[PDB]
Design a protein around this ligand. Structure first.
Ligand SMILES: Nc1ncnc2c1ncn2[C@@H]1O[C@H](COP(=O)(O)OP(=O)(O)O)[C@@H](O)[C@H]1O
Ligand SMILES: Nc1ncnc2c1ncn2[C@@H]1O[C@H](COP(=O)(O)OP(=O)(O)O)[C@@H](O)[C@H]1O
Ligand SMILES: Nc1ncnc2c1ncn2[C@@H]1O[C@H](COP(=O)(O)OP(=O)(O)O)[C@@H](O)[C@H]1O
Ligand SMILES: Nc1ncnc2c1ncn2[C@@H]1O[C@H](COP(=O)(O)OP(=O)(O)O)[C@@H](O)[C@H]1O
Ligand SMILES: Nc1ncnc2c1ncn2[C@@H]1O[C@H](COP(=O)(O)OP(=O)(O)O)[C@@H](O)[C@H]1O
Ligand SMILES: [Mg+2]
Ligand SMILES: [Mg+2]
Ligand SMILES: [Mg+2]
Lengths: 146, 147, 537, 523, 535
């Protein structure tokens, strides 16, 4: 049994439009899971654990931590909700829907033969203008009042 | 194809996974691990050239590979192998007297003679483009430690 | 008859064609991650770990290879990090295209030793031409040279913003760790900058901590976590109970002498902790271990004690704060002296909030004013990318401040060497002129890859690129077209002198020396013998 | 060819295992049938692994080698050599196998002596030419004085049957073998002597029938014995003829015409039998089968009808009665009828056989072999077949030589006398030819248990100075005169032992390469 | 890399390329020489009169001991395409000439062995092949120097017997070296057409039967068939045979189409009996009216027709083969008659002693035709001690029948025993210096390979190769070159003209021509595309 003269054995290679438009559909899939858990008319989602327990919740962080995915771009969205859970309290479900929608409109420009660095350079200019808008519409709070 | 200044190196990848590039004839035959019992004696022939001379390793296999190749027609002429062994010694004892007439007596104090000798052995290796530095460093590393 | 080896033997042009496809298998991977229009990749392991990176060293180190000609190009990228530090996608593409053009020569029955000797005449002439066609040293541009060279390295990575936020933090970090040496050597050790990662706010909230940022906790929750005007006591010995060695045993013959030996294991221990604390020391850093009995003496006296710190982190604090790394008792048969005049100094030691972890910061250290950078990203995949991109950016400003010489980036060096070596091959070229002529075409793959990844015109933009560099060498009318590069956002040749696209000199000198030397070793595999794996005997 | 072998499943050898496998495979054949040579040698019993094994004991060397199935390539030459010896002379198949094996055993002794194998072939061709003149000059002819030729024929049958199972039956089986060929009075067809084997009784109860025996007993309502009859045989179809017109049907319009055709068919079958009885016969033998419609016609006329005897049964009846086959009955004046005295039926072993007692011009015999088991009858049939074939050729070639080791020492003396008049290159190969000829009386002497080292030494000393008729006496264990004891063999039998063994040893000694191909369905 | 691209795609060119074998290299020419030298070293020991035979075993277990080079290479199971071309080389010599099938394989292996050392010196393989054509042309023109024969096929059969003794001297028929050599001479001259110089081997029937000895092989002028007298009381000896050859079976005439003859009344069924009764009396009387006393029939006999042969004293045989009766009508001068009505006295054959001979205890009874009248068909009856010595004698005597056929095609001879190979080796060495421009080394490799055939005769005869060849070759340069070779017992002097070692010119002319062209097709090949396993 002679070995086959190969290079980089037992690994995969994938490039082109199947990775740019492939990571969008993995981000749209997670955003459709917790889409019914944002408003006040939301519903609980009963989950099952490998230990035998049951997690019945509607919080966006506790749902995504109980999901084991195999897609690499789907593993990035779970760590986003873990970051929002440690920084603030109620900043979970809103980021996963918003990052799925900002990538939903980003898939449209990738079909128009536009480079992805042009969309990111427009995203960073748009990110610097969203911070300045919230600071103008804010309101000071009297923390001494109960 | 690994002899002379226009020769190319060989790379032997062993079963462990330590592949090395080698051009010297002693280092090639020790890594090939030939299973034939008559070919393993040619591996030890290049080993003793590395011990005695050090710069005769690929050429001792070309000679011994051709002296046996010349015995292919000799054994098909009814010549006994003991007669070939007697005549190979008579050609060997006459062969040293021919090489002695071509030899020129030199002295170790002449640095230009020792420099051209070390540059010849580097022309067959990968450092033939680095013979302007390694060949002066090979002479100065020897002639300062020999007294 | 044939060779009786138990392995496999392949001669001729079979291995001469396999080594080129082995080198092109690596170059076609990293060709999509070169330049400001380059894009990152995904490195997924079998256990499930995902690594998003675009550096040429991190990709090829984690990627498994089998071919012996493939391990040469993978180990070539590892040498670029230690020697230069950002030059580690461009070396792999040049060294593989050096084998692709030399394969076309050996198929024309040209001997490879003439190609090896022809490459050495073109590699030494490329270093000679780049050292006589530099623009200026670091005196005319000043601080604008360090910022523009930093932004060129970040353009291929995640921190390539249009602003100068990440560019100013790198220049202010290298300039704060200027360590002088003997014979006039202003060394800049970039490994002393502690680069930390934390999944927090956006990239615009990356703090530049002037001092040091220790990645440890206080331990006991009864110590003051903020000490103003602190005195750091750097020491490396475990503050635990006094355990006897192997050669010493306790063999008691009297039961009345039992309890005095048991109390002596804590009295000798607390005797060290009272003489290092009565000298005004408030912060104690320990690489060993402080057990729960010794933590009481810091809560009672109001001192901070940090246990189990790294040995590489203690040397960066004691050198920057003037502290002395003490391992035991010393100073000429003294019982307990501690040399209290050799304590460290600090303005403020404060444990801040780093998004649900504890991080200790030291402010300005009062002796050397070191610097540490705390990075802020969205997830852990961005923080591993921001750490690799910042470490490659620290190596760029290190080589510019050490070797005060910069070259124009964006394919301006490879365009000038593509035309000077064609005229160099015509003067002294008799039989090795075809190897020097193919050395110029192999260098043209660096501006060719910038046009492919930008989805711009390929055979017209590079043809317009070398049109300006040809007139700068054959028309001596002071055209000053030696700094003509590529504008990948517009698709036209621009001047890299005014645009601020600067690269260090040794990011291309050491790149052309390592790629030419690696192309010689793979050019001498005309015979290859592969033995069978010896595993089960 | 072993180095860098370019064969798929085939193997070969050149000058190392070629002569090694040829000398091992040929000596083991000769050492197998070595114990069956001589008047005191034992016999073998041949058996298979199963599936109707059909055990057949034989002492003759041809029947042993034709059933063993040797896998050795060079051993099949000696197997085929003994097959021709049984088909040509019918005797000496064991003697030609040991002699061809002793030549290659002496040729194996010339391996270490570094003798060229072509020198041994040229040395044995001159040795075989000297051995032909020893048998030709010592052959005893017999022309007239027939009372000495019939005594000489009993010495031939007494020598052949002494090396078989019929040891203590030479007073009877010699007369059964001499008188069987003596009643032929012509060519040795070797098929008129029909041997019938019946169980029950001893071998001394066997006899030679004065007439002829047959099976397929006489009809249903026909007479069993007719005195002074005229035997007419036939080879024609009796009923359901379908006479020689392929593609002829009976296409009629009514069933009353079918009854007229089938009555016309039986009238032509009746008219055919009426043409047979116009010869004036009393017995009828048909090679084909006789159905019921002509059987009633022979029974009504008082005529016998023997139906479907054999294909070769009508040939023996034509030689024992003196008639003809007569397959067409249209000329009674041109058909010669047989002659007999009694066609009574005898019972041999609870089986009724038709005895043709008292036949005229009886050039055919019937040997009624009776034995204890079927294994004895199968051995005594081959033992009688090895005796009748030599006497059928002794009447054609009356030259006889003195057997019992006397002929082999005469052949070995002529080679040794010419081995001393040759140079030393071929003289060593001629001495090995004479030593193998002396092995043939050595195998006979050692099979009885005698001192074979001294008896052959006494034969070599006797033939060196006179004594051309001195041989080995196996009765007492000494050296006696072969003309007095009456131990003679035929000249053509002893010539074919010498000549075929010298030609077969020439083929195997000239082989330096055995290239066997890949066999089919062997994995 | 193989089976994969640099972009990660699978790289499949041909189907099942993983189980393929491809060699271009420098060992592809080396693998052809080492495969051809082992065939030449096998056939080297079976050359000359001291050549030892080989034992061949078939797939069915049958063993045939062969010495001729045509049957040795044909009965091998060699699955090597280079050695398969050596099988067709020995087959092409047997089909054209049929004498040097052993020597044409040793010569082809000698040209490839000398080309191995020429390949290491840097010479192109086609340049060696172009040098062998310029060297073999000298060997053809030098072989036509001394060539003469005085054969007249009347009384000067002495050059014809000595030519056949050279072919039969290497086989196992050396015991009948004078007897069997005269059989093959007279068998050709009685059947050959000297006006067209054409010999037909269909007229020479070679039959064999076990029994007797090798000295009992006789040349029977006529035919030898298996006699099948349907009547056991038929006379087994005819003194003067008027042979009536017919091809119609002794039966009522059956048509070739479907008939279905209808019988209606009893008068039609009685007409069926009288039709066949008069038909068997008509087919018997029409032979007796021609004066015939012997009949040959291809098909079977009826039982009613068998007794009518004995009443009319007309012996007849039954079930003779196709080409067997074709040989009877030429040996007896008769004509083969389709029907019985076309029989006449002019279509009868004439023969003398027609009898059957029983061989020992068997029941064959073959036909022996002693006397004839100007027959153009003979039959050789080979006898022996076993079937190994008969099937070899059928192959040995067929080589003796071919060398007499080659003398009628071309009446020029040479002298064998290595005498023609040494003389041709001196002609290439003399023209190698006129001129030694490019093909000097290729012509000297041809002359060194032509000396392998005479030095193989010195090896098989127990002599020394380089000692005996140096003595014979030096004597042809010091004087005018005679017919100087070697022998086994050496016959005193080494003169081939005195030892009567005579070979045909066109036999050795095709040995050099076929071995050179087969070397050119195995030197002009630089790739092997053989598959791997069987399934
Ligand atoms: N009474 C209400 N009327 C309208 N919108 C509401 C009301 N209560 C909650 N929401 C919206 O529901 C969203 C819930 O977000 P949530 O999933 O809690 O974020 P996180 O996952 O970060 O905790 C908020 O963004 C808020 O705007
Ligand atoms: N400049 C040169 N010109 C021509 N031939 C050279 C030159 N330099 C080296 N050589 C040849 O290259 C060969 C190298 O042999 P080498 O492999 O070193 O032998 P060994 O294996 O015994 O050391 C020498 O025999 C020498 O003749
Ligand atoms: N603003 C720019 N305009 C044109 N080219 C640029 C710009 N910024 C970077 N580049 C090019 O992108 C390339 C990035 O190379 P890089 O992958 O960082 O090399 P290494 O892997 O050795 O760090 C540089 O060679 C440089 O010429
Ligand atoms: N009465 C006898 N005295 C001496 N020798 C005898 C006597 N009878 C038989 N022999 C020997 O026994 C041998 C038997 O040989 P046998 O096996 O019959 O040969 P084959 O098998 O060829 O017929 C004969 O060679 C003969 O010489
Ligand atoms: N009496 C002899 N003396 C010397 N050589 C002989 C003698 N008889 C035959 N030879 C040689 O033996 C060789 C036998 O060749 P052979 O094998 O018959 O060729 P092929 O196989 O073509 O028939 C001939 O070339 C011939 O030169
Ligand atoms: Mg050297
Ligand atoms: Mg007998
Ligand atoms: Mg011949």
């Amino acid at each position: 049994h002679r070995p086959v003269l190969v290079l980089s054995q037992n690994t995969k290679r994938e490039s082109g439009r199947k990775v740019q438009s492939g990571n969008i559909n993995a981000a749209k899939t997670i955003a459709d899971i917790i889409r019914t858990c944002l408003g006040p008319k939301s519903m609980m989602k009963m989950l099952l654990d490998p230990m035998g327990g049951i997690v019945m919740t509607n919080d966006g962080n506790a749902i995504l931590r109980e999901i084991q995915v195999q897609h690499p771009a789907a593993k990035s969205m779970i760590e986003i909700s873990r970051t929002q859970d440690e920084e603030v309290g109620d900043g979970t479900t809103s980021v996963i829907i918003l990052a799925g929608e900002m990538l939903s409109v980003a898939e449209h420009f990738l079909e128009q033969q536009m480079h992805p660095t042009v969309v990111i350079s427009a995203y960073r200019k748009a990110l610097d203008d969203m911070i300045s808008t919230l600071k103008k519409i804010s309101i000071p709070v009297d923390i001494s009042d109960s | 194809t690994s002899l002379g200044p226009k020769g190319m190196d060989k790379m032997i990848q062993d079963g462990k996974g330590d592949v090395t590039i080698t051009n010297d004839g002693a280092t090639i035959l020790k890594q090939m691990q030939v299973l034939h019992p008559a070919a393993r004696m040619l591996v030890e022939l290049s080993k003793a050239q590395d011990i005695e001379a050090g710069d005769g390793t690929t050429s001792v296999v070309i000679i011994a590979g051709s002296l046996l190749d010349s015995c292919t027609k000799l054994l098909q002429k009814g010549i006994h192998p003991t007669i070939i062994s007697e005549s190979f010694q008579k050609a060997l004892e006459k062969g040293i007297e021919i090489l002695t007439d071509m030899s020129r007596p030199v002295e170790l104090s002449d640095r230009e003679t020792l420099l051209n000798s070390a540059t010849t052995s580097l022309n067959s290796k990968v450092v033939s483009q680095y013979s302007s530095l390694l060949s002066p460093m090979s002479v100065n590393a020897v002639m300062k430690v020999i007294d | 008859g044939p060779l009786s080896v138990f392995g496999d033997r392949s001669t001729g042009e079979t291995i001469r064609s396999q080594n080129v496809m082995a080198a092109a298998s690596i170059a076609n991977i990293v060709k999509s991650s070169l330049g400001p229009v380059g894009l990152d990749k995904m490195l997924v392991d079998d256990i499930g770990d995902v690594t998003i990176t675009n550096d040429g060293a991190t990709i090829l180190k984690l990627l498994e290879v089998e071919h012996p000609a493939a391990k040469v190009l993978c180990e070539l990228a590892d040498l670029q990090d230690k020697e230069v530090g950002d030059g580690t996608t461009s070396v792999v593409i040049i060294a593989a295209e050096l084998l692709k053009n030399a394969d076309e020569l050996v198929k024309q029955k040209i001997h490879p030793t003439s190609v090896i000797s022809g490459y050495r005449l073109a590699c030494k002439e490329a270093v000679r031409y780049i050292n006589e066609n530099l623009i200026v040293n670091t005196d005319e541009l000043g601080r604008d040279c360090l910022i523009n060279a930093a932004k060129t390295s970040m353009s291929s990575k995640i921190i390539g913003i249009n602003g100068d936020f990440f560019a100013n933090m790198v220049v202010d970090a290298v300039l704060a760790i200027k360590y002088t040496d003997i014979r006039g050597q202003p060394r800049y050790p970039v490994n002393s900058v502690n680069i930390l990662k934390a999944h927090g706010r956006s990239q615009m909230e990356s703090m530049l901590i002037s001092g040091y940022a220790l990645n440890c906790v206080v331990g006991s929750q009864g110590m003051p976590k903020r000490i103003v005007n602190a005195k750091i006591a750097c020491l490396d010995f475990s503050l635990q109970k006094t355990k006897m060695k192997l050669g010493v045993q306790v063999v008691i013959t009297d039961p009345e002498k039992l309890d005095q030996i048991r109390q002596r294991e804590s009295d000798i221990t607390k005797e060290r902790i009272q003489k290092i604390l009565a000298t005004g020391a408030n912060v104690i850093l320990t690489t060993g271990g402080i057990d729960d009995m010794c933590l009481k003496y810091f809560v009672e006296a109001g001192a901070m004690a940090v246990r189990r710190v790294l040995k590489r982190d203690l040397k960066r604090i004691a050198k920057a704060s003037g502290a002395t790394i003490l391992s035991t008792l010393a100073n000429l048969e003294g019982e307990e002296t501690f040399e209290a005049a050799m304590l460290g100094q600090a303005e403020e030691v404060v444990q801040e909030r780093i998004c649900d972890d504890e991080l200790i910061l030291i402010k300005n250290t009062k002796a050397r004013t070191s610097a540490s950078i705390i990075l802020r990203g969205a997830n852990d995949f961005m923080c591993d990318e921001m750490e690799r991109s910042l470490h490659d950016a620290l190596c760029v400003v290190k080589r510019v401040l050490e070797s005060k010489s910069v070259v124009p980036g964006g394919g301006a060096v490879e365009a000038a060497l593509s035309i000077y070596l064609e005229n160099y091959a015509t003067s002294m070229g008799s039989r090795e002129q075809l190897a020097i002529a193919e050395f110029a075409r192999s260098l043209l793959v660096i501006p060719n890859t910038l046009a492919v990844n930008a989805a711009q015109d390929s055979t017209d933009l590079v043809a317009k690129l070398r049109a300006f560099h040809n007139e700068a060498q054959v028309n001596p009318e002071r055209k000053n077209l030696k700094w003509i590069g590529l504008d990948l956002s517009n698709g036209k040749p621009r001047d890299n002198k005014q645009a601020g696209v600067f690269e260090p000199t040794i990011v291309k000198v050491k790149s052309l020396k390592f790629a030419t030397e690696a192309a010689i070793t793979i050019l001498r595999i005309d015979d290859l013998i592969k033995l069978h794996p010896e595993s089960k005997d | 060819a072993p180095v860098n072998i370019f064969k798929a499943g085939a193997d070969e050898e050149r000058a190392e295992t070629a002569r090694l496998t040829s000398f091992i495979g040929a000596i083991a054949i000769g050492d197998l049938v070595k114990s069956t040579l001589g008047p005191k040698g034992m016999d073998k019993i041949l058996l298979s692994s199963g599936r109707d094994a059909s055990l057949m004991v034989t002492n003759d060397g041809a029947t042993i080698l034709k059933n063993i199935g040797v896998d050795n390539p060079a051993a099949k030459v000696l197997v085929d050599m003994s097959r021709v010896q049984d088909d040509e002379v019918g005797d000496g198949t064991t003697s030609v196998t040991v002699l061809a094996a002793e030549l290659l055993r002496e040729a194996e002794s010339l391996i270490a002596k570094k003798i060229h194998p072509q020198t041994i072939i040229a040395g044995w061709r001159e040795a075989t030419k000297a051995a032909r003149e020893a048998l030709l000059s010592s052959a005893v002819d017999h022309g007239s004085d027939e009372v000495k030729f019939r005594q000489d024929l009993m010495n031939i049958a007494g020598t052949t049957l002494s090396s078989k199972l019929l040891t203590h039956h030479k007073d009877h089986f010699t007369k059964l073998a001499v008188e069987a060929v003596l009643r032929l009075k012509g060519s040795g067809n070797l098929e008129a002597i029909h041997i019938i084997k019946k169980l029950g009784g001893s071998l001394a109860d066997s006899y030679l029938d004065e007439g002829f025996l047959l099976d397929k007993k006489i009809g249903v309502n026909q007479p069993k014995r007719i005195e002074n009859a005229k035997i007419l045989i036939a080879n024609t179809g009796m009923d359901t003829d379908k006479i020689k017109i392929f593609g002829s049907r009976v296409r009629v319009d009514s069933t009353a015409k079918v009854a007229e055709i089938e009555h016309a068919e039986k009238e032509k079958m009746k008219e055919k039998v009426e043409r047979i009885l116009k010869h004036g016969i009393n017995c009828f033998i048909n090679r084909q089968l006789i159905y019921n419609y002509p059987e009633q016609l022979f029974g009504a006329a008082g005529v016998m009808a023997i139906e479907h005897a054999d294909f070769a049964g009508v040939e023996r009846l034509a030689l024992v009665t003196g008639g003809e086959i007569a397959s067409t009955f249209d000329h009674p004046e041109l058909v010669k009828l047989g002659s007999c005295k009694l066609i009574e039926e005898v019972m041999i072993g609870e089986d009724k056989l038709i005895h043709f007692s008292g036949v005229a011009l009886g050039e055919a015999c019937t040997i009624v072999l009776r034995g204890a088991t079927q294994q004895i009858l199968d051995e005594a049939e081959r033992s009688l077949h090895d005796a009748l074939c030599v006497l059928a050729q002794t009447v054609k070639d009356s030259r006889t030589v003195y057997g019992g080791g006397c002929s082999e020492m005469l052949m070995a003396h002529a080679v040794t006398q010419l081995a001393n008049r040759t140079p030393g290159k071929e003289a060593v190969a001629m001495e090995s030819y004479a030593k193998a000829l002396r092995m043939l009386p050595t195998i006979i002497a050692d099979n009885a248990g005698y001192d074979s080292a001294d008896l052959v030494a006494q034969l070599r000393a006797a033939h060196s100075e006179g004594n051309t008729t001195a041989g080995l006496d196996m009765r007492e264990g000494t050296i006696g005169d072969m003309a007095i004891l009456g131990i003679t063999e035929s000249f053509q039998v002893k010539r074919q032992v010498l000549l075929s063994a010298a030609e077969a040893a020439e083929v195997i000694l000239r082989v330096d390469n055995i290239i066997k191909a890949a066999p089919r369905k062997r994995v | 890399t193989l089976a994969f691209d640099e972009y990660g795609r699978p790289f499949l060119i041909i189907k099942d390329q993983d189980r393929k074998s491809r060699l271009m290299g420098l060992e592809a020419l080396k693998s052809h020489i080492m495969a051809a030298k082992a065939v030449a070293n096998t056939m080297r020991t079976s050359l000359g009169p001291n050549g030892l035979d080989k034992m061949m075993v078939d797939k069915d277990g049958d063993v045939t001991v062969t010495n001729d080079g045509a049957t040795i290479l044909s009965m091998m199971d060699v699955d090597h395409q280079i050695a398969k071309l050596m099988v067709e080389l020995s087959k092409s010599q047997d089909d054209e000439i049929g004498d040097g099938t052993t020597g044409v394989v040793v010569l082809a292996g000698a040209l490839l062995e000398e080309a191995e050392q020429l390949l290491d010196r840097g010479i192109h393989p086609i340049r060696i092949a172009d040098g062998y054509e310029q060297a073999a042309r000298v060997a053809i023109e030098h072989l036509d120097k001394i060539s003469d024969s005085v054969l007249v096929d009347i009384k000067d059969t002495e050059p014809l017997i000595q030519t056949a003794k050279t072919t039969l001297g290497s086989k196992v028929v050396n015991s009948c070296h004078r007897q069997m050599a005269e059989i093959a001479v007279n068998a050709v001259l009685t059947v050959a057409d000297m006006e067209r110089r054409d010999v037909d081997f269909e007229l020479i029937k070679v039959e064999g039967k076990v029994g007797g000895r090798l000295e009992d092989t006789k040349l029977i002028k006529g035919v030898i068939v298996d006699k099948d007298f349907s009547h056991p009381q038929m006379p087994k000896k005819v003194e003067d045979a008027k042979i009536a050859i017919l091809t119609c079976p002794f039966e009522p005439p059956k048509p070739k189409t479907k008939h279905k003859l209808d019988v209606t009344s009893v008068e039609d069924y009685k007409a069926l009996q009288k039709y066949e009764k008069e038909k068997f009396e008509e087919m018997i009387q029409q032979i007796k009216e021609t004066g015939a006393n012997l009949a040959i029939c291809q098909w079977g006999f009826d039982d009613e027709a068998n007794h009518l042969l004995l009443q009319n004293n007309l012996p007849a045989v039954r079930w003779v083969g196709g080409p067997e009766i074709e040989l009877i009508a030429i040996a007896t001068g008769g004509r083969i008659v389709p029907r019985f009505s076309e029989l006449t006295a002019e279509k009868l054959g004439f023969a003398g002693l027609v009898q059957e001979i029983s061989f020992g205890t068997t029941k064959d009874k073959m036909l022996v035709i002693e006397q004839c009248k100007n027959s153009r068909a003979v039959t050789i009856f080979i006898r022996g001690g076993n079937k190994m010595i008969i099937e070899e004698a059928k192959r040995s005597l067929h080589d003796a029948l071919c060398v007499i056929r080659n003398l009628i095609r071309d009446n020029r001879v040479v002298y064998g025993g290595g005498a023609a190979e040494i003389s041709c080796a001196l002609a290439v060495s003399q023209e190698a210096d006129k001129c030694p421009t490019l093909e000097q080394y290729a012509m000297r490799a041809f002359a060194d390979a032509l000396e392998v055939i005479p030095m193989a005769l010195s090896e098989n005869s127990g002599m020394n190769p380089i000692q005996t060849m140096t003595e014979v070759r030096a004597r042809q340069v010091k004087e005018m070159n005679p017919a100087l070779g070697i022998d086994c017992l050496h016959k005193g002097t080494n003169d081939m003209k005195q030892q009567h070692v005579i070979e045909t010119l066109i036999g050795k002319k095709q040995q050099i021509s076929l071995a050179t062209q087969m070397v050119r097709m195995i030197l002009k090949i630089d790739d092997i595309r053989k598959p791997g396993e069987s399934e």
